[PDB]
Design a protein around this ligand. Structure first.
Ligand SMILES: Cc1ncc(COP(=O)(O)O)c(/C=N\[C@@H]2CCCCNC2=O)c1O
Ligand SMILES: Cc1ncc(COP(=O)(O)O)c(/C=N\[C@@H]2CCCCNC2=O)c1O
Lengths: 439, 439
């Protein structure tokens, strides 16, 4: 009753509406250091989710502290709309320099992935005068009217969709569409769907190079390249959404580096900001210059957020985090393989760098999803002092996206906590887990 | 050529797409202190726009520095979605405590005004299962697909509009609809429009208590109260958008305090964040609890942004800024009245606190808007070291929304720079002003 209602979690219930909440257990945070969160009572936890990938440098990283304090004390105004400002320009410069399109592309800045996907779509349709768009079932591209319009994930399933939207199955090696582990069946479908619409009616294609919230799915080898070829054959812009899986997390700087294509447009978000809201679209000049005063919010490109972004990119260099994500990802995936030797629930282990997914199944032959078991597992992890969540259209993929700065010892220890969670998930009752709405 | 292209402004052109730009002159900022901006070359300017109202506490205010550094060094994670966090909860607590609905309302957090208006609409329609909405011509409620749907300003004029949207004329004492300075003609229209739709089909009404970008219009006395009565008679939720004109700027904490009604929903933004992206919807519980995992972005309610918000509210108390905005607004408006004795171009002076508008006309009898003259005026102000912009559906209202911390001497000096701009606006050529796209 009153003590529980009076604590930070119970206060959260009383003050903050459930509209934006995605809660699985009563995590109630008052501080953070490194890869640790600190609850109101002082209890420490290891954040395997790394705030869903946003805490790219963990919590209280010196580079973020310095850049944000400096920017606070001497800000170049508060916006990029009606002034140029030094940090946003230098950020935009560094991002386009990182991209193979350095010679032909510019940047738009936003507050979130949703903002950024929304802008890219609006810009392509504006530039092009066409409405049609290809995206994937399971694809999470935002939670705003404009971004949910071409999303395919459960969260957006009730949302109004874009005129000319074609949603395709994302090819899952673990559950392959039409039993084809190559994904060519999806490409054949695409072509067939394209033959049924007017020539040149599709302007855009959205893809995640790993589908994150749809269930950490690394698509079959060659699939994305061949997908991009088709798009290019029809003059369709390829937009790569690397809001979850970009900027060093995959063990390459840009996830598309694993996949033998370069996108026309690259979308970035979450960890770009290091804990502050920051997003960007890197796209051909003629796309982002087709209009002005068109996709704008007052605080877009504010210097504190832009300084945080520069800090993240600078730290990716200084601490060699692209290599560190590769190295620690391998370690993490190896620890998980050892868990699979002990716990039959583990049906699959997948991912690249520190974007890792573990799929849980009731039987390894049937692959029946283990939804109830997954929900309790993460609850028991939280009790044990490990934060991670589940994703996927079946509620049954554990997601791991820790800060790129997480140490090797922390990885080892997260795997051991995970091991104990597997051993103990049914100590969590149905009634307890039922209290949290989840997805 | 190359020197100009190499400077901060020319670099802005090369790196950042025009999509989000709203440029009137080549302002190119590298720092900021108090109510001053500092350009790349070191030239200082007084920021009368206060970054469009976002720089509520000016630049480098000690309270914002401290709160943002503290939060950076020890963040309570990075989000409110899958954890409660201490700064967001305390912010939400303080905001609901400020509102007359303290007993019945909760908070949603967003990144921008657009985000926040979008959420409120989606929440009302979700709670209610109705789509219809009332808003005003000239009303700027956002620049995202979901917020432009019930906006009425030029920026959103091409955007897809909400099914059941009714757009009304906003009653302008200076140009009154149907020659009725009371606004009752607008209310009569509303009722007539409402008689033509099915009973209970309209869920929401959006209003700015002063219309800001539609031309700093303070509506006639009693109009908003009577408008709210009608809405209430039809069970329609009144959403008050105080993203531009809220939190002390009007000389009361909440602008609706001037207008004899309490809204059902209050929307806040811009200056709430003090230079960081922050917004909030304060709305009845049953509206914000009608769903979960519904209107969510990863970095919503991040602690750095929430700490900045707490700093702003705390500074509004410590420095008594509600009174300071009233006092300095009066001063500003008096200086402007003296300008009107010298410059026939000044047709009207209006506003409340430090939300002030000056309407420029070719002739005071005709009230013909002076669009070209306004564009040059602000260009000449920029040259002289004063930043302010124009708004309004006729391009002819100078807007003044300086930091609430701007000193009385700075006000006096801004008025003198303004005086010289009026005296010298035609020193600016057509060719020079033409280089900037504006709205
Ligand atoms: C009354 C009112 N409500 C909502 C908004 C939207 O806020 P965001 O730009 O933070 O999305 C605005 C925002 N901005 C306009 C337009 C472009 C930037 C300059 N200032 C504005 O007031 C507003 O004035
Ligand atoms: C691939 C991909 N693209 C776009 C987004 C949208 O980003 P925002 O939540 O910052 O608007 C997401 C964002 N977020 C989901 C869903 C709710 C919060 C947790 N993590 C996600 O990845 C994403 O994963």
């Amino acid at each position: 009753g009153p003590a529980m209602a009076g604590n930070l979690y119970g206060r959260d219930g009383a003050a903050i509406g459930s509209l934006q909440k995605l809660r699985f257990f009563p995590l109630a945070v008052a501080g953070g250091q490194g890869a640790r969160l600190v609850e109101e009572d002082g209890r420490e936890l290891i954040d395997l989710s790394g705030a869903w990938g946003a805490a790219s440098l963990g919590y209280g990283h010196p580079a973020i502290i310095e850049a944000v304090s400096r920017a606070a004390a001497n800000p170049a105004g508060a916006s990029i709309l009606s002034a140029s400002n030094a940090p946003a320009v230098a950020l935009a410069e560094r991002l386009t320099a990182s991209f193979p399109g350095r010679g032909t592309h510019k940047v738009w800045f936003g507050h979130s992935g949703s903002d950024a996907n929304e802008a890219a779509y609006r810009a392509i349709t504006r530039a092009t005068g066409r409405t049609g768009v290809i995206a994937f079932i399971g694809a999470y591209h935002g939670c705003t009217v404009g971004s949910m319009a071409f999303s395919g994930h459960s969260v957006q399933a009730d949302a109004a969709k874009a005129d000319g939207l074609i949603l395709l199955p994302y090819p899952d090696p673990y559950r392959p569409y039409q039993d084809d582990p190559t994904g060519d069946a999806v490409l054949a479908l695409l072509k067939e769907r394209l033959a049924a619409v007017p020539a040149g009616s599709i302007a855009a294609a959205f893809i995640e190079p790993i589908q994150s919230d749809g269930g950490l799915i690394v698509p079959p080898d060659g699939f994305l390249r061949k997908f991009a070829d088709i798009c290019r054959a029809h003059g369709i812009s390829v937009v790569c959404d690397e809001v979850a899986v970009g900027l060093a997390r995959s063990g390459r700087l840009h996830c598309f580096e694993h996949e033998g294509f370069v996108p026309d447009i690259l979308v970035l978000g979450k960890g770009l900001g290091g804990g502050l809201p920051l997003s960007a679209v890197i796209a051909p000049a003629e796309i982002l210059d087709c209009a002005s005063a068109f996709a704008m919010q007052t605080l877009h490109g504010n210097p504190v957020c832009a300084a945080a972004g520069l800090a993240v990119l600078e730290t990716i260099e200084a601490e060699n985090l692209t290599t560190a994500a590769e190295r620690k990802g391998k370690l993490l995936r190896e620890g998980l393989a050892r868990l699979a030797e002990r716990h039959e629930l583990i049906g699959d282990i997948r991912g690249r760098g520190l974007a890792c997914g573990v799929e849980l199944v009731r039987n390894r032959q049937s692959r029946e999803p283990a939804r109830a078991e997954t929900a309790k597992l993460i609850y028991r992890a939280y009790e044990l002092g490990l934060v991670l969540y589940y994703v996927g259209m079946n509620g049954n993929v554990l997601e791991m996206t820790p800060p790129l700065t997480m140490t090797e010892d922390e990885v080892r220890h997260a795997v051991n906590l995970l091991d104990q969670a597997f051993t103990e998930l049914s100590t969590v009752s149905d009634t307890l887990v039922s209290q949290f709405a989840g997805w």
